[PDB]
Amino acid sequence: TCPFYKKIPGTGFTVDAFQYGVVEGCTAYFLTHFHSDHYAGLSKHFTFPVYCSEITGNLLKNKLHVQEQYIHPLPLDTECIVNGVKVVLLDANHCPGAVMILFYLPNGTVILHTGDFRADPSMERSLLADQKVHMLYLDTTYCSPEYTFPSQQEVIRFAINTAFEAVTLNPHALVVCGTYSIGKEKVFLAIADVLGSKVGMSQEKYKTLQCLNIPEINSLITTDMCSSLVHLLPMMQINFKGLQSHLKKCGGKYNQILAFRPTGWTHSNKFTRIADVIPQTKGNISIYGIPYSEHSSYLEMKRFVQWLKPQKIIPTVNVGTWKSRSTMEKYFREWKLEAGY
Numbered sequence: 001t002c003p004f005y006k007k008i009p010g011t012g013f014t015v016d017a018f019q020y021g022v023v024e025g026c027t028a029y030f031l032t033h034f035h036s037d038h039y040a041g042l043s044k045h046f047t048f049p050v051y052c053s054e055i056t057g058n059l060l061k062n063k064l065h066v067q068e069q070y071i072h073p074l075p076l077d078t079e080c081i082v083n084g085v086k087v088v089l090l091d092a093n094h095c096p097g098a099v100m101i102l103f104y105l106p107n108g109t110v111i112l113h114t115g116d117f118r119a120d121p122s123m124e125r126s127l128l129a130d131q132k133v134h135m136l137y138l139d140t141t142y143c144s145p146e147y148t149f150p151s152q153q154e155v156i157r158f159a160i161n162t163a164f165e166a167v168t169l170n171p172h173a174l175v176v177c178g179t180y181s182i183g184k185e186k187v188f189l190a191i192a193d194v195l196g197s198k199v200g201m202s203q204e205k206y207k208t209l210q211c212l213n214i215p216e217i218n219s220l221i222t223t224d225m226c227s228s229l230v231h232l233l234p235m236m237q238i239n240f241k242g243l244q245s246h247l248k249k250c251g252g253k254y255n256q257i258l259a260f261r262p263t264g265w266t267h268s269n270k271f272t273r274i275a276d277v278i279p280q281t282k283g284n285i286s287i288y289g290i291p292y293s294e295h296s297s298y299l300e301m302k303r304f305v306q307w308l309k310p311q312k313i314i315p316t317v318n319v320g321t322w323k324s325r326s327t328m329e330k331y332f333r334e335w336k337l338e339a340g341y
C-alpha cells in the first residue's frame with residue numbers, strides 16, 4: 001500500500017506512486033522523472049492521467065508504450081490548473097526531464113515536492129522566490145555531513161583532461177563509459193567532443209537518448225560503433241572481464257581501454273581530492289570511478305532548506321530505518337535553530 005510521503009493532502013494527487021495498483025481517491029498521478037524506482041508499475045495498460053514534463057512524456061510513450069491519451073505533459077515555469085488545483089513544474093537539476101512540483105492547495109497551504117534534485121543557488125531565483133512554502137517533501141539521499149563531492153564542472157574537467165591525455169599518447173586507446181539509466185550524459189558527451197568523435201552505443205540506448213531534447217544530438221551520437229572511439233556500455237560490463245571481452249570484439253583496432261564509472265558518492269571522497277583520483281589497472285585496462293552526482297551534497301541541501309524556511313519537512317529517501325529517520329530529524333532541527341525560523 002501507498003506510503004503517506006507519496007500522497008499530497010487536500011488533493012486527489014499522488015507523486016511517483018505507480019507500483020501500488022489503483023490508489024484509493026487518486027484522480028491524477030504525477031511522475032517527477034524517468035528513473036525505475038520512481039516509474040515502477042507503469043506500462044501500456046495504464047489508464048489514469050499521468051502528469052509530467054515533455055521529456056518524461058517522450059520516454060513514457062516510446063520506451064514504456066503508455067498510450068498518448070493518458071500522457072499529460074506540462075511546460076516548465078508555468079502556472080497550470082490540474083483537476084481544480086494550481087501547480088507549477090520547476091527544473092530539478094537531476095536527469096533530463098526531472099522536475100520539482102509546487103502545489104497551491106485550495107485552503108492556502110503551499111507544498112514543494114523536490115522529486116530527486118541537486119540543490120543549486122540558481123533555484124533561489126525561480127518562481128520559488130515569490131511566496132511562502134509551508135511543507136517540503138525533500139530528497140534526503142545524502143543527508144549526512146560526510147557526503148561531500150565536487151561540482152559537476154570540476155568532475156567533467158578531470159574526465160576531459162584524462163581522456164585527451166591518454167588518447168593523444170596512444171591513438172589506439174578506446175574510451176568506454178558505463179550507464180544504466182538516463183542522467184550524467186555530460187560525462188560521455190564532453191569526452192567525445194574533446195576527441196572529435198561521436199559516441200557509439202546500442203540501438204536501445206540510442207532510442208532513449210533520442211527522447212531527450214538535447215540540442216544538435218544527431219551530431220553527437222551513433223549506432224555505428226566502428227566509426228566511434230567513445231563507446232557506451234551497460235554499467236555491469238565496466239569491470240576487467242567485461243572490458244577484455246569488449247576489446248576482443250573491436251577486431252584489433254585498439255590495444256588499450258580507458259573506462260569511466262560515474263558513481264554517486266564513494267568513501268574515497270572523505271580523504272581524497274578530485275585532482276588526486278587514480279584508477280584501478282590490470283594490464284592494458286584502466287578504470288576510473290568519478291564522483292559525478294545528480295543529488296544534493298549535504299551542504300547544498302542545507303543551504304536550500306535554510307533559504308526556503310519550510311514549516312514542516314517530509315523526507316522521501318532513507319525513510320526505512322529508525323536510525324536514519326532520527327539522524328535526519330536531528331539535522332533538520334540544527335538547521336532551524338542556526339537560521340532562526
Ligand code: NI
Nearest residue numbers: 033035094116
Ligand atoms: Ni532519480
